[PDB]
Amino acid sequence: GPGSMENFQKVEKIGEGTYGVVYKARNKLTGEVVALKKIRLDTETEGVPSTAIREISLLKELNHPNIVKLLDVIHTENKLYLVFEFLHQDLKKFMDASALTGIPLPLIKSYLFQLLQGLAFCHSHRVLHRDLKPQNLLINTEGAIKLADFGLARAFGVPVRTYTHEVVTLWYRAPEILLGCKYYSTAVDIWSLGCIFAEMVTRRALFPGDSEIDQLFRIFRTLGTPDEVVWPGVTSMPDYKPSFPKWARQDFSKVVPPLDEDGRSLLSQMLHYDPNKRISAKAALAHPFFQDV
Amino acid sequence: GVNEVPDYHEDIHTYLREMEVKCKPKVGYMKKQPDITNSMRAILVDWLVEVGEEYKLQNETLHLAVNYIDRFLSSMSVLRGKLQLVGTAAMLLASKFEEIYPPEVAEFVYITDDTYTKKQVLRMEHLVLKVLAFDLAAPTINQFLTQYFLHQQPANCKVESLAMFLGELSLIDADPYLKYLPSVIAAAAFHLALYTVTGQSWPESLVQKTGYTLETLKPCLLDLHQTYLRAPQHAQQSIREKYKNSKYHGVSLLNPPETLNV
Ligand SMILES: O=c1cc(Br)cc[nH]1
Numbered sequence: 001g002p003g004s005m006e007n008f009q010k011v012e013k014i015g016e017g018t019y020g021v022v023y024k025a026r027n028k029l030t031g032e033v034v035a036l037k038k039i040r041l042d043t044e045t046e047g048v049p050s051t052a053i054r055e056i057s058l059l060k061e062l063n064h065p066n067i068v069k070l071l072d073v074i075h076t077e078n079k080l081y082l083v084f085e086f087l088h089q090d091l092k093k094f095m096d097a098s099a100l101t102g103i104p105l106p107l108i109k110s111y112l113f114q115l116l117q118g119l120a121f122c123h124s125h126r127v128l129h130r131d132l133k134p135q136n137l138l139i140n141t142e143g144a145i146k147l148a149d150f151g152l153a154r155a156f157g158v159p160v161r162t163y164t165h166e167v168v169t170l171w172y173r174a175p176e177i178l179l180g181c182k183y184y185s186t187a188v189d190i191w192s193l194g195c196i197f198a199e200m201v202t203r204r205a206l207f208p209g210d211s212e213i214d215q216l217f218r219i220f221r222t223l224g225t226p227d228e229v230v231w232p233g234v235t236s237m238p239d240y241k242p243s244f245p246k247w248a249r250q251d252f253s254k255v256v257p258p259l260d261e262d263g264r265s266l267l268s269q270m271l272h273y274d275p276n277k278r279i280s281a282k283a284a285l286a287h288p289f290f291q292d293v
Numbered sequence: 294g295v296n297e298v299p300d301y302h303e304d305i306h307t308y309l310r311e312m313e314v315k316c317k318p319k320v321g322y323m324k325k326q327p328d329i330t331n332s333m334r335a336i337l338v339d340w341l342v343e344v345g346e347e348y349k350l351q352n353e354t355l356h357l358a359v360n361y362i363d364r365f366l367s368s369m370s371v372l373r374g375k376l377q378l379v380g381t382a383a384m385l386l387a388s389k390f391e392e393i394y395p396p397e398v399a400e401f402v403y404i405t406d407d408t409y410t411k412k413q414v415l416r417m418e419h420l421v422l423k424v425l426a427f428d429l430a431a432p433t434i435n436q437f438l439t440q441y442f443l444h445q446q447p448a449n450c451k452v453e454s455l456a457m458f459l460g461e462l463s464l465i466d467a468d469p470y471l472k473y474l475p476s477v478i479a480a481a482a483f484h485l486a487l488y489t490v491t492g493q494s495w496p497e498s499l500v501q502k503t504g505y506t507l508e509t510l511k512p513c514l515l516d517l518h519q520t521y522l523r524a525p526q527h528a529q530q531s532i533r534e535k536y537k538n539s540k541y542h543g544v545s546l547l548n549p550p551e552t553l554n555v
């Protein structure tokens with residue numbers, strides 16, 4: 001709208017999603033460093049892809065310090081460039097590359113708190129993210145962390161209706177999705193963040209399944225196989241099976257041993273089986289875990 | 294439970310109220326269109342209802358498309374020959390936004406009886422995106438209705454379907470319904486549906502939520518009551534046909550009340 005490509009100087013390639021590549025670039029007039037996401041449309045025979053229609057439309061609304069900021073959209077006849085604020089790294093690379101003796105607890109706290117602020121803002125604005133994972137959380141040099149990659153996101157109504165099944169990268173996917181439930185809601189994003197919290201502490205994925213059924217069984221062996229008492233309705237869910245093994249819930253202090261009482265408390269509330277009892281982002285912001293952020 | 298987002302439904306309602314003002318078409322645009330009329334638009338929307346049925350699209354998709362059209366026609370003059378092209382592109386965009394499995398472009402070309410080419414549809418999709426600056430997450434009548442439904446005691450499916458029906462009828466007639474915001478039409482529809490099926494009225498709990506009273510809703514109620522009474526006579530009938538179906542509890546067959554006692 002405001003910009004054109006002539007004011008940008010590409011610096012280097014920084015990644016790629018589908019539909020194309022991401023470059024780091026510099027605005028030649030203002031000095032601003034940006035990420036340019038190319039979406040190729042001339043190759044597309046179905047016009048502008050729905051992932052991009054959702055990403056652009058939803059990100060235009062979502063203005064928050066912990067959500068990656070869409071600065072502009074350059075729409076040529078043949079190409080679409082999304083101009084974003086630049087952030088140097090994602091949380092996955094940070095975990096791998098630094099964080100060899102760990103992420104210090106203050107930084108884990110700061111990050112989780114920010115992630116929860118970002119997510120609460122999404123939910124307050126009728127948006128499910130539906131792909132929260134460390135690769136889609138970007139950090140800058142100042143200590144901020146921000147939700148990114150809204151290609152899988154969706155504007156919901158209240159109450160929710162049936163949306164796309166099999167969303168969320170498997171390791172971060174909530175049990176209600178895995179059991180084929182007719183409806184899912186804001187709670188699926190909380191589940192992902194719970195997994196991410198754990199992963200920040202250990203630097204390994206909490207539930208690294210190789211399949212839908214393996215993913216379920218890994219959750220069950222950690223949190224116990226759910227029944228009607230812990231999760232009313234679970235046994236009536238489309239892909240629940242009576243033959244599921246009945247694993248005992250293990251002590252939660254063995255799930256993430258280095259984690260303190262407050263951390264354990266918050267983590268357990270994020271990983272509650274029942275989507276109705278699972279803590280909201282809004283409510284989690286007040287958890288005692290964050291008192292010293 | 295969480296499917297009703299208890300912790301967010303108020304924030305969401307407030308935000309939608311703000312956005313429906315932003316996403317509002319110009320009330321008087323049809324008079325500024327040299328070559329098209331309310332009647333032509335009624336034909337278009339009625340056809341989009343059929344298309345919605347033919348492809349088993351969500352009702353939300355239909356409402357979004359109508360929003361896109363009305364905003365587009367608020368700044369772009371269109372010849373009658375191209376009105377359907379705008380509508381086809383709008384329905385495509387709404388489908389890509391809202392549907393799990395949107396129909397392919399080819400199917401959208403097919404339903405225009407090859408009046409247009411695939412290239413024309415795709416170029417109009419771009420133009421529509423440019424004109425709306427990609428602001429596609431617009432509040433609809435339905436987004437408000439579903440929230441209002443949560444104040445029923447108890448829930449009644451004929452009330453819900455009847456309200457949806459009345460809300461859809463309002464899409465057809467730019468005069469008078471362009472003057473009313475989605476949240477107001479939804480309120481009028483909900484009250485009228487509730488009153489018709491059960492004799493009850495707009496509940497106090499929704500007065501609390503919305504700020505709207507029967508006084509506030511009175512003008513819209515009076516138009517919507519007229520629309521309901523006249524609906525068998527209207528030139529466009531696709532919504533009545535659609536809501537005869539058991540999917541919507543055959544609500545279009547319910548008799549409208551002769552008076553409202555407001
Ligand atoms: O490096 C990046 C990538 C995206 Br996408 C957005 C901001 N920064």
Ligand SMILES: O=c1cc(Br)cc[nH]1
Nearest residue numbers: 213241242243244245
């Ligand atoms: O391997 C499995 C086990 C069960 Br029970 C159901 C599906 N697949």
